[PDB]
Amino acid sequence: TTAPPVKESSFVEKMKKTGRNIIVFYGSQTGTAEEFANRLSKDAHRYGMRGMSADPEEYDLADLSSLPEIDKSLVVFCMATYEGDPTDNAQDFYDWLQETDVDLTGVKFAVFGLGNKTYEHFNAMGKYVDQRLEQLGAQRIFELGLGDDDGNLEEDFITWREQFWPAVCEFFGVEATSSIRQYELVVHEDMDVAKVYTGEMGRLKSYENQKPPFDAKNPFLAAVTANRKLNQGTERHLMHLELDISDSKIRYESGDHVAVYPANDSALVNQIGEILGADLDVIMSLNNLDEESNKKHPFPCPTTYRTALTYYLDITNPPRTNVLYELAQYASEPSEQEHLHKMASSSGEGKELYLSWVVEARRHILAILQDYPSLRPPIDHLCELLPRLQARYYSIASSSKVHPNSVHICAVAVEYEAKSGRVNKGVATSWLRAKEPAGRALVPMFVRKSQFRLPFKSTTPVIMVGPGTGIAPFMGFIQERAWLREQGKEVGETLLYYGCRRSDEDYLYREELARFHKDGALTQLNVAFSREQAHKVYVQHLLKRDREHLWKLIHEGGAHIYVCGDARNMAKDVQNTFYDIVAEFGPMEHTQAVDYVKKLMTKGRYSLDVWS
Ligand SMILES: Cc1cc2nc3c(=O)[nH]c(=O)nc-3n(C[C@H](O)[C@H](O)[C@H](O)COP(=O)(O)OP(=O)(O)OC[C@H]3O[C@@H](n4cnc5c(N)ncnc54)[C@H](O)[C@@H]3O)c2cc1C
Ligand SMILES: Cc1cc2nc3c(=O)[nH]c(=O)nc-3n(C[C@H](O)[C@H](O)[C@H](O)COP(=O)(O)O)c2cc1C
Ligand SMILES: Nc1ncnc2c1ncn2[C@@H]1O[C@H](CO)[C@@H](O)[C@H]1OP(=O)(O)O
C-alpha cells in the first residue's frame, strides 16, 4: 500500500503550451530508465522536434487519448521491471492499462524495456506496455526494445536508439538538424548557512530536524549501535550491523529490505576537485534553463560541489556513453577527444574500447580523468552530467518480533583490484564498514516492504536456502520461529541450508545458529563447506541429499521454499535441483517438474531474495 500523489494537469496540454511533440515517460527505481528517458527527450531536439521526460506517477495516462491533438506527436516509454512487476512509480499506469477501455486511436508509441535475463519474468513490464497500448488502439512506431542488464544495457540502448530516430524521422518526414546545457550555474557569495544543503535528500535540514513518517524522500538517521566482523580470515570482510530505529515509528517484518543513503570516499571526491583544479567548497546552484520543468535542479541546491560529489552524485560506476560523449569537448589532446567521442558507437573499435577500457576495467570518472589527462571539464558541467547516487538495499537480518526497534544488516565489504589498475571500493559497504558505534554514527535509511515472508501459519514447514550473505533474512526468520515456539505456538519444521567456504573461516552467525539448533528452533542446520574437501560441496548438494524428506515437506506438508543470495548461478542451480527432486518423486518428466516448481512460485510457496 502507498498513498497516491496529486496528479499534475494533463501532460498533453503542457506539451501544447511548451511546443513539445514527444514525451518520454520513465518507469524507474534505480534511476536508469530516468536517464534513458532524459537522453531520448534530449535527442528529439537534434531532429527538429522537441521533447520532455516525465514521471508517469505524476500524471493521468488516460490523457494519451488527447495526444493526437498535437501534430506528429509521439510517446515513448522507458520501463524497467522489478520482481516481475512495474516499478513503484509505474504501478498506477499499470493498473490503469489493465482496467481502462479508452480508445487510443491515433496515438503513436514506442517502448524500451529495462530488464535482466537472469530473472524469471524478463522485461515483463516493457513487454506488457508495448502489447497493451496496441490492444487499446495505438500504433507502434518502432519495435519493442529489450534491454538486458545481464549483458550490457547501455549497448542495447545505443543500438535501439540508433535505429529508433531514423525510423521516427522517416515516418514523420522530419530530418536531422552542438553541446547544450540543461542547467545554468549560479554561484552564491555571502549566502547564509541555513539555506545550503549538506547531504539531506528532501527538505532543507530534514536530516537535522527529523519528522516522521520516514521514507525514501525523508530517511531516518539510524544510530549504528553495533558493527562487528563476522568472518575469521583476512581474505574478505563480512560484517553485521545493528541500526537503532527507536522513535522512528518505522515498522518492518523479516523479509523486508532496508535501504541506506551512503557517502562517497572523501579522498575520491578531493582528488576529482584537485585534478580539475576546482574549488569544491564553492556554494552554488544548477538551475534548469527550462523554467517550465518541475525539475529545478539536478540535485538539492544550493550546495557545494564537495557536498554534491559526496552525497548526491555517483562517481564510482563506469560512466555511460553520453557522459563521455559530452565530456569529449573538454579533452585538448585530439586522440583523447576522439576516443571519448567514439565511446557512443554502436559497433567497431569505438564500442570495443568502451566495453573493455571503461566497463570491463571498471574505470570510474576519476580514473578516466587520470588516464586521459587532457580531459579537463568545468566542475559544474561534470556535476550536471553525473548520475544520482542511489541508495543501497540490504535484506533485514532481524525479526521485528524480537527487535522492533533495531534493523540488522549482514553484508560483505566490496573491495577489489580492477583491470583499470586501481583498487575499487564499494560505496555503501566501505561507508558502513567505517561507521563506529558511539559522536553518534548515523545511517540515513528507510524500509521497503517485500513479499518475502514467513508462512502465515506457524505450523507450515519452512525450507531456507541462503549461502554466504544469503543467510541474512533467515537470521530474522529463525529468530521469529524461535520466538513463536517460546510463545507457546506450534511450529512446523524449520530447515536451514547454508553454505560457506570453511567452518573456521567464514561461517557466519556460527554461535547463534548452533544455539537455535540446540534449542530446537532449527529442525536442521545443514551447512555446505565448499572448500573443506577437493570437491565443491554446495547447498544444492545437500538438498539433493535430503530429496526424499524435502519432497514430503513440499508435497504433503505445504512447505514454503526460500532462496536468498547469488541470483547468477546459485539460485538457478538450486532451482534445477528442486526440478530434479520433484521429477523423481512426483514422479514426472522434467518439463512437468519445471511447471510444478514455477507454480509453487505463483502460489506463494517458493520465494526469492536474490541479487547480483
Ligand atoms: C534486494 C537486494 C537485496 C540485497 N541484499 C544484500 C544483503 O543483504 N547483503 C549484501 O551484502 N548485499 C545485498 N545486496 C547488494 C547491495 O544492495 C549492494 O549492491 C552491495 O552491498 C554493494 O554495494 P556497494 O555500494 O558497497 O558497492 P557499489 O559501489 O555499489 O559497487 C557494486 C558493483 O561493483 C562491481 N563489482 C563488485 N565486485 C567486483 C569485482 N570483483 N570485479 C568487477 N566488478 C565488481 C559490480 O558492478 C557491482 O555491481 C542486495 C541487493 C539487492 C538488490
Ligand atoms: C531486486 C531486483 C529485482 C529485479 N527483478 C527483475 C525482473 O523480474 N525482471 C527483469 O527483466 N529485470 C529485473 N531486474 C533488473 C532491472 O529491471 C534492470 O536492472 C533495470 O535496468 C533497472 O532500472 P532502473 O534503474 O531504471 O529501475 C531487477 C533488479 C533488482 C535490483
Ligand atoms: N553455484 C553455487 N551454488 C551454490 N553455492 C555456491 C555456488 N557457487 C559458489 N557457491 C558457494 O557459496 C558460498 C558463499 O559464497 C561459498 O561456499 C561458495 O563456494 P566457493 O566460493 O568455494 O565456490
Curated annotation (Swiss-Prot):
Residues 217-455 form the FAD-binding FR-type domain. One of its GO terms (cellular component) is cytosol. Its cofactor is FAD; FMN. This is NADPH--cytochrome P450 reductase. PANTHER family: NADPH--CYTOCHROME P450 REDUCTASE (PTHR19384:SF17), NITRIC OXIDE SYNTHASE-RELATED (PTHR19384). It is a single-pass membrane protein. The gene is Por. It catalyses: 2 oxidized [cytochrome P450] + NADPH = 2 reduced [cytochrome P450] + NADP(+) + H(+). Binds 1 FAD per monomer. Binds 1 FMN per monomer. Residues 1-612 are cytoplasmic.
